[PDB]
Amino acid sequence: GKTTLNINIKTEPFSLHPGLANDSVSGGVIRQTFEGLTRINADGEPEEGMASKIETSKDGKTYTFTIRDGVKWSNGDPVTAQDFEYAWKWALDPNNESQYAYQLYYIKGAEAANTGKGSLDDVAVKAVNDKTLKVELNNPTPYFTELTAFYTYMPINKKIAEKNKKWNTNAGDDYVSNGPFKMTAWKHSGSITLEKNDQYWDKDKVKLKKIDMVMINNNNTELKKFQAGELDWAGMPLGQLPTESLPTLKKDGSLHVEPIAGVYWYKFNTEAKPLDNVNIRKALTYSLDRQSIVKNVTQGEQIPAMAAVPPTMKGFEDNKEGYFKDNDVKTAKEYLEKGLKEMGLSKASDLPKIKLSYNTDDAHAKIAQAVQEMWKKNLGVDVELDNSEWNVYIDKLHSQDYQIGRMGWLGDFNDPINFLELFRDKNGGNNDTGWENPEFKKLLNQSQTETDKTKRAELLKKAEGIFIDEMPVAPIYFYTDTWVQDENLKGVIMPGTGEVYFRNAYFK
């Protein structure tokens, strides 16, 4: 069985600093090259990683991590509690402009430090000694060992980071990592090579020696390379199949199709006219024919989304039907008319220019062209399209330099709030819409203190209801992962949240 794995990651990562990464491309790499206090096992549950033992206080708020004996970076240096402390505080430092700082707000003092209302010293992550990390949360958080497996909670080599502020931007002596693989090459916009890391504590269970990740943003070509034997995988999570090929691949029985905790949505910049008008947002959302899109455009067995939280998330199964009606043109026309009245306008032709944006990808263009048609036919609303390379695109949305913007969101841990708290705060890193609601916030925060699971769930549903009512985003569909593979590739870890770990993968 061969020991090299050839896959497409489509495009240049946003960042291979674990504290700046906020995307599937970045995460696809880092998830191979770093390891947190915990990692995800085959059954999608957290288990011990860099921490050999985890202790939680009686009150549930204080976690004490014992750092495994002998764990090392890829240059041989020990991994220490200090490395974690530094990483986490680095991500929270507002100067470093992590879009995922809010992911660390579960730690006491984290939000204050990040917002400028408090000292980084008072963030309650503490390297007590080299082998002991002590963490105090604002509230008992039963998924915290999921968060510590998430890439924002990765350690970085403190010594090298302090020496070279740009360590993360190139492969080389200054790029070191603690995961089952290490990155031995990175040609920007070309590819990345990972190799088994001989310093990783659990290296005896790692079978691959090399992973070549190419950067082909062309779905057709990915499948050709796969059909030629030059890739061992074609499609998601890291690549993509061309939509016209899914008929065939379903018919020959090769295609894998899996529902995942993820949502495809069109984000509105609620601070840019005319998307600042809630009525216009609703008219654009309600006038969508999502069943058409998932049957006729994407053809990947996606489920129409009329909600934020995927119905895989237990307690939220009835988001299958969602908060409103799909292809509800009557209601959309009502909203349009109301919003038109508020502007002193009679006809939708006289709205200001609207540009709908997405990241370069034939699949996203096909969806955008369908939606553009829906708006023209159903509302009389003209929109012009544009596309950008992924990493630039992420900054375009984060900086609100857009009106409507395609985005997709996969769960970072198995809790419904991951689909909600990204909109808690106006300048949240992953919000992008400029929206916030006081009641929405209050309920989110109340959910984090509620000890009964069903009552908590109701708070989140309430919150979701307010969200959908103000429509800062337009839900389109809940995700699937579709791919074909060399069926000799065994042991790949793919949890319901739609990521992939190659740590224990092999060819038989």
Partner: peptide, 5 residues
């Protein structure tokens, strides 16, 4: 996380 696909 933001999904490219």
């Amino acid at each position: 996380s933001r999904n490219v696909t």
